[PDB]
Amino acid sequence: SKIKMKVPLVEMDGDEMTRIIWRLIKENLLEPYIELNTEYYDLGLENRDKTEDQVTIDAARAIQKYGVGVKCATITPNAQRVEEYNLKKMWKSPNGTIRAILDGTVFRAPIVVNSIKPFVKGWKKPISIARHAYGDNVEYYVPSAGKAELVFTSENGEVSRQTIHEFDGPGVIMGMHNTDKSIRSFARACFNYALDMNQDLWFSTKDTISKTYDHRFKDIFQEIYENEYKEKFEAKNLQYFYTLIDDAVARIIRSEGGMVWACKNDVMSDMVASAFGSLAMMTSVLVSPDGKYEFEAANSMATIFAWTGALKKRGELDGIKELVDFATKLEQASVQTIENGVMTKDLASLSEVPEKKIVNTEDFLKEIRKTFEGM
Amino acid sequence: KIKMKVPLVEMDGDEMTRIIWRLIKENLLEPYIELNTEYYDLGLENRDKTEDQVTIDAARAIQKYGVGVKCATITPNAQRVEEYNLKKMWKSPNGTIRAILDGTVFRAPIVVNSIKPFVKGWKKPISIARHKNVEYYVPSAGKAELVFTSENGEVSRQTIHEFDGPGVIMGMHNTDKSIRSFARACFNYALDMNQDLWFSTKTYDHRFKDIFQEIYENEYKEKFEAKNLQYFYTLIDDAVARIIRSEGGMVWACKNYDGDVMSDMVASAFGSLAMMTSVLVSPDGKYEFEAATSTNSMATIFAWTGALKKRGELDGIKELVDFATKLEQASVQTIENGVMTKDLASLSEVPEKKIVNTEDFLKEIRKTFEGM
C-alpha cells in the first residue's frame, strides 16, 4: 500500500527544464510509493504573470497555514524572457517575496557523496551555512573634501552624531544597520533549524573589535538561547557555540562538519560551499522564527533532496514514521546509485568511482528507482 | 663572513620572542654574516620610556634604508598597563609602523611536506593581503543617516534606516588615496615574488575595481607581462572556487573584513598559525618582515631571511641572497629529518622524532646547514 499523508505539502512549480525534471521526479520516485497530498501553486513565469504575482503571496501564506513547502527553481525575468513570454513586468524573484512573508533565514548545505571528495579532508558531514537574508546597506560617494558623519535623530527630535572621517579627497562611506527584532528573528530560526537537524549551532562575529554592533548579536543569541532553546538543546545533547570568527574557522576546519554555522549579514560561506564540491550539489532551506520551512534546490539530486527534506519534515510533524523513513531511504538510494557508478555527465566529472556508466537525467531517475527497490 | 652594504632596520620585541630573536642571531646569522643593522628596541619598557617615540623613529628608519625586520611585541591592554606601570595605552607598533609607511600586509604560510595540509592540494604558499568604525546603539524609534558636509557647505544625507525599535548602526569609510596605496603595494609584492595578483569583491566595490584596473594599465601592465604574470580580477564567489581548486602560489587581495577570514582559512588550511610569515610592503617599495621551553621559532627565522634576501637583492649582494635561501631550506630540511619542537611534532607525521627544546632546534638547524 502506498504511504498515506495527512496535512498537505505546499508544492510550488518552477520554470523551464527544472519543471520537467520536477515532474519526472514525482513520477518515478514519489507517486509510486506515496499517496502524494500537496496543495499546488504554479510559480512558473507564465502563471506569475497572469496572477500579477498574487500566486506567490498565496503560496507563502499557505506555507504559514500548513508548515512546510517545497519549491522548484524559478527564473528571474530578463529583457529577453519578457519578450520570449510577453510579460507585463520584470518581476522580483519569488524567493525574495516568500522569504519576507515568512520572515525566514536561509540555510544552505551540501549533499555529501563519498565518491565526491571534499577539498577539506575531514569534512564528511554537511555544514549548513545560515544567513538571515541572502543576496543584497547604503553607500555615498564623497566627491571632495569634507566631514562624514553617522547620525541618529530620535522620535523627539534629539540628534546625535559621530565623525566617520574627515576627507581630504574623494572616497566612499557606508552605513549598516540591524534591528533587535531582525537579530532575534535570525537567532530563533538558527536555533529551530539546529534542533530540527540535531546538530550544534555555531555563531561567530568579530566582537572584540566591534564593541557594540557585534556585541548586540552576541547578547541576543545568548538571551534567546537561555529563555528559549537551552532546555531543548540539552534534552538532545546539542550545544550552542558562540565564538570569534578566527577561532571558529580553525575549529571547524579541524572537524568532521555536521554543524549549523551562522554569521552576520559572505565569503566564509562560499568557501564552505566550494570546499564540498559544486554549488549545484546543495540544498537550500528557509526556516522561520516560527518553525515554518520551505525546501528548494540551491541537478536532479538537489531537487530530489528538496522533496525528501520536505517529506521528512512533513512526516515528523504529523507523526508518520513510514514517511520519514521513506525520505531517508530515497536519499540513501540516490546516493547509493551514484556510488554504484550510474550517474549523469555532471555527477561523473565530480565523482571518483572507477567504473562509471553515464546516462541521461531520465534514466538516472530510473536507476535510483531500481536501487530503491533493491533496498 | 658575508659583508653587508646598507643596514637592515632591526626592531627588537618582547619577552620570549626577544630571547629567541637573540638566539636566532647567535646561532644562525652572526657566525656567517657581519650583521649590519640599525637597532631599535620596541620592547615595551623602552616604548614606554621614549613614550613610543622609538617606534616612530623605527618607521622612519625604514623609509630611509628600505627594509626592516621586526620582533613580535606586546600590545598593551588594561592588564598590561598595570603589570608594566605604563604611562599610557601605547598603540600597537605594528599599527604605527603600518600607518607611517602606509603599507599593506601580506601573510603566507611556511610549507613543509611532512606537515599535512587540511586542504587537498595547496602545495604553494598563498599570500593574503590587507591594507576602525563608528557604531551606535539605537535605543528607541527614530532615523539613522549617513551625512556628509562638504567643505563648500553642502550637506547630503542618505537614510540608513527608519527604526521603530532599538538596534544598531555602523558607518565606515575608504578614501581613493587608500585604495591606491593598496593596489600599488599589491602589485609591487606580486612582482617581487613572481606571483599573479587576484582581487575580488555598487559604489563601494566598483570604486575599488576601477582604481585597481587604472593603476594596472598605467603602472604595472608593462612590468607584469615582462615576467608573464596575470592580474586577475573577479567575483569573490568565483575566486574562492578557483583558488580552492588550484595549487596555491598567488597573491590574493581582499577588502579588509574579507582578508580577515581567508587568512584564517588559508592559515589554518595549511596547518598552524605558527608557520606564518608576514611582510609589510609600501607603495614606495619599502619592506618590513615580521613573524605573522620548546618553542617554534620558524616564522621568526623566515622574517630574518626574508629581510636579508631582500636586502641582498637591493644591494646586489648575491652571497647574502643565496645564504638566506640556504638557511630557509636548512630550517625546513631539519624538520623533515624529524628533529623539531614539541609544538611542531603534533603537526608533522613522518617519522621517529627527536624533539628538542627552543635553543636546541636552532643548534640542530645550524648542524643541518653545516652540511651542504
List the grid coordinates of B261.
577570514
Q: A287 forms bridges with which residues in the sheet?
A: A105, A293
CA distance A124 to A212: 36
Indicate yes or no: CB of A139 within 8 angstroms of CB of B176. no
A142: left (phi over 0), alpha (psi -120 to 50) or beta: beta
For residues B56 and A208, what is the distance between their CA atoms, to the nearest angstrom? 27
Measured in whole angstroms, the distance separating CA B174 from the mean position of its chain's CA atoms is 21
Give which of A294, A295, A361, A296 is closest to A334, Cα–Cα: A361
- CB-based burial of residue A121 (10 Å sphere; 0-12 exposed, 13-18 middle, 19+ buried)? middle
Would you state the torsion angle of the CA atoms of residues B264, B265, B266, B270, taken in this order, to the nearest 10 degrees? 100
User: Shortest Cα distance from B7 to chain A (angstroms)?
Assistant: 36
- Count of residues in chain A: 375
Residue B148 φ/ψ, nearest 5 degrees: -130, 135
CA gap B187, B253 in Å, rounded? 10
Amino acid at B20: I
Q: Which three cell numbers stand for residue A274?
A: 566550494
d(CA B44, CA B71): 12
Q: Which cell goes with A194?
A: 539546529
Residue with cell string 575566486: B239
Strand order in the sheet with A260-263: A38-42, A9-13, A68-71, A293-297, A282-287, A105-110, A128-131, A260-263, A201-205, A240-244
What contacts B210, CB < 8 A, 6 or more positions away? none
Contacts of B133 in chain A (CB under 8 A): 210, 213
Task: Give the integer Cα–Cα distance in Å for B309 and B321.
Answer: 4
| CB-CB contact of B178 with B201 (8 Å) | no
Scanning the structure block, which residue is given the C-alpha cell 605594528?
B94
Provide the angle, in degrees to the nearest 10, between the axes of the packed helices B318-337 and B298-314. Answer: 160
> How many degrees, rounded to 5, is the angle at CA A95 between CA A104 and CA A245?
50
HSE-CB of B313 using CA atoms within 13 angstroms: 14
Q: How far is CA B335 from the centre of its chain?
A: 23
- Phi (first) and psi of residue B310, to 5 degrees: -55, -40
User: Is A171 within 8 Å of B177 when comparing Cβ atoms?
Assistant: yes
CA-to-CA distance for B230 and B225, rounded, in angstroms? 8
Non-local CB neighbours of A139 within 8 Å, separated by 6+ positions: A172, A173, A174, A175, B158, B202, B203, B204
3-class SS of residue A360: coil
Q: How many CB pairs under 8 A join A and B?
A: 231
Measured distance CA(B176)–CA(B204) in Å, rounded: 10
> Who contacts B364 (Cβ-Cβ below 8 Å, separation ≥6)?
B334, B339, B356
Instruction: Give the DSSP letter string of A108-128.
Output: EEE---TTS--SBTT--BPPE
Among candidate residues B65, B12, B58, B5, the one with its CA nearest the CA of residue B286: B65
For residue A331, the distance in angstroms to the closest alpha carbon of chain B comes to 27
Amino acid at A364: F
- Beta strands A128-131; A260-263: pairing state: parallel
Question: From the CA atom positions of chain B, what is the Rg in Å?
Answer: 23
Domains of chain A: total: 1
Per the CB < 8 A criterion, the answer to whether A2 and A342 are in contact is no
B33 forms beta bridges with B2
For A307, the domain range is 1-375
Residue of B166, B170, B202 with shortest CB distance to A213: B170
Instruction: State how far residue A171 is from chain B, nearest Cα, in angstroms.
Output: 4
CATH of the domain at B289: 3.40.718.10
Which residues fall within 8 angstroms of residue B228, CB to CB, at 6 or more apart?
none
Structure-block grid coordinates of residue B358 = 627552543
Among A272, A280, A336, residue whose Cα is nearest residue A114? A336
d(C-alpha A325, C-alpha B268), whole Å? 39
To 5 degrees, how large is the angle CA B312–CA B318–CA B321? 55
Burial class (CB in 10 A: 0-12, 13-18, 19+), B111: middle
Which segments of chain B are extended strands (E)? 8-12, 37-41, 67-70, 104-109, 127-130, 134-138, 143-150, 155-162, 167-175, 197-200, 231-234, 251-253, 276-281, 287-291, 339-341, 354-356
Residues in contact with A357: Cβ distance below 8 Å, sequence separation at least 6, in sequence order: A341, A342, A343
- Decide if A152 contacts B145 (C-beta within 8 A): yes
Whether A247 and A255 have beta carbons less than 8 Å apart is answered as: no
Residue type, B319: E
Tell me the three state secondary structure of residue A285: strand
**Beta bridge pairs of residue A232:** none
Contact B102, B96 (CB under 8 A): no
A125 DSSP β-pair partners: A257
Query: What distance lies between CA B340 and its chain's CA centroid?
Result: 24
End-to-end Cα separation, chain A, in angstroms: 17
Write the DSSP symbol of residue B91: P
The SS3 of residue A87 is coil
Question: What is the CA angle B125-B131-B136, rounded to 5?
Answer: 125
DSSP B135: E
Spatial distance between the Cα atoms of A238 and B121, rounded to a whole number of angstroms: 33
Q: Which amino acid is at B122?
A: W
Q: How far apart are CA A209 and CA B256, in angstroms?
A: 13
* Interchain proximity B137–A212, CB inside 8 Å: yes
Of A177, A250, A266, which is closest to B169 when you measure between CB atoms?
A177
Q: Which of B332, B371, B362, B365 is nearest to B22 (CA)?
A: B362
Yes or no: say if B101 and B42 are a contact pair by the CB < 8 Å rule. Answer: no
Solving technique: X-ray
B297 vs B294: CA distance, rounded Å: 9
User: Which B residues, 236 through 255, put their C-beta within 8 Å of a C-beta on chain A?
Assistant: 236-237, 240-241, 244-245, 254
| DSSP conformation letters of A265-280 | ---HHHHHHHHHS-TT
Helix (H) or strand (E) holding A357: strand A357-358
Q: What are the φ and ψ backbone dihedral angles of A309, each rounded to 5 degrees?
A: -55, -40
Sequence-distant (6+) residues with CB within 8 A of A359 are A342, A343, A344, A367
**Residue for cell digits 534514466?**
A363
Q: Which of A96, A65, A273, A287 is nearest to A187 (CA)?
A: A287
Which amino acid is it at B59?
A
- Kindly give, in sequence order, each residue whose CB lies less than 8 Å from that of residue B277, ignoring residues fewer than 6 positions away: B107, B108, B109, B110, B125, B289, B291, B292, B299, B302, B303, B306
Interface with chain A: mutation pick from B169, B200, B273, highest number of A CBs within 10 Å: B169
Query: Residue B108 corresponds to which amino acid?
Result: A
Q: What are phi and psi of A100, to 5 degrees?
A: -80, -30
Cβ atoms A101, A283 nearer than 8 A:
no
> For residues A205 and A265, is the Cβ–Cβ distance under 8 A?
no
- Alpha helix (H) ranges present in chain A? 16-25, 45-50, 54-66, 79-81, 94-102, 180-197, 213-224, 230-235, 245-253, 268-276, 300-318, 321-339, 345-350, 361-374
Q: Which of A289, A293, A337 is nearest to A115 (CA)?
A: A337
Q: In what order do the strands lie in the sheet with B197-200?
A: B37-41, B8-12, B67-70, B287-291, B276-281, B104-109, B127-130, B251-253, B197-200, B231-234
Q: What per-residue string of b and e applies to A173-192 under the rule 16 or more CB within 10 Å gives b? A: bbbbbbbbbbbbbbbbbbbb
Q: Which residues contact A303 (CB under 8 A, 6 or more apart)?
A: A18, A21, A22, A25, A72, A73, A297
B235 close to A (CB below 8 A): no
Strand pairing class (A138-142; A171-179): antiparallel
Q: How far lies B194's CA from each of A12, A100, B72, B226, B254, in Å? A: 53, 49, 28, 11, 19
Torsion angle defined by CA atoms of residues A313, A318, A322 and A326, in that order, rounded to the nearest 10 degrees: -20
Residues of A in contact with B134 (CB under 8 A): 150, 162-164
Q: What is the dihedral of CA A85, A90, A94, A96, to 10 degrees?
A: 160
Q: Which of A21, A105, A13, A90 is nearest to A59 (CA)?
A: A13
Residue A150, beta-bridge partner list: A162, B146
For residues B162 and A154, give the distance between their C-alpha atoms in angstroms, rounded to a whole number: 10
Q: Search chain A and give the residue with CA nearest B269.
A: A253
User: How far apart (Å, rounded) are the C-alpha atoms in residues B50 and B56?
Assistant: 10
Contact of B231 with B197, CB cutoff 8 Å: yes
Q: Residue A122: what residue type?
A: G
Query: CB of A72 within 8 A of CB of A12?
Result: yes
Dihedral sign from CA coordinates of A244, A245, A249, A255: positive
The CA distance from A133 to A100, in Å, is 9
d(CA B252, CA B199): 6
Q: Which of B169, B160, B162 shows the shortest CA–CA distance to B135?
A: B169
- Whole-angstrom distance, CA of residue A163 vs CA of residue B146: 10
DSSP assignment string, A287-332:
E-TTS-EEEEE--HHHHHHHHHHHHHHHHHHHT-HHHHHHHHHHHH
Q: Return d(Cα A56, Cα A49) in angstroms, integer.
A: 11
Using the Cβ of A155 and the Cβ atoms of chain B, whether some distance falls under 8 Å is answered with yes
CB contact under 8 A, A274 and B141: no
Contact B190/B184 with Cβ under 8 angstroms?
no
* H helix or E strand, kind and range, residue B101: helix B93-101
Any idea of the CA torsion for A45, A47, A48, A50, to the nearest 10 degrees? 120
Question: Which H/E stretch holds residue B318?
Answer: helix B318-337
Nearest to A278 by CA among A252, A248, A302, A313: A302
C-alpha–C-alpha distance, residues A91 and A57, integer Å: 13
Distance from CA of B174 to the nearest CA of A (A): 5
User: Quick one: cell of B36?
Assistant: 649590519
**Nearest CA to A118 among A237, A214, A257, A242?**
A257
**To one decimal place, what's the resolution in Å?**
2.3
| Cα-based distances in Å from A315 to A326, A338, A346 | 10, 26, 32
**Closest CA of chain A from B233, distance in Å:** 16
Residue type, position B263, single letter: S
What is the rounded distance in angstroms from the CA atom of residue B201 to the CA atom of residue B221? 21
CA A11 to CA A314: how far, in whole Å?
12
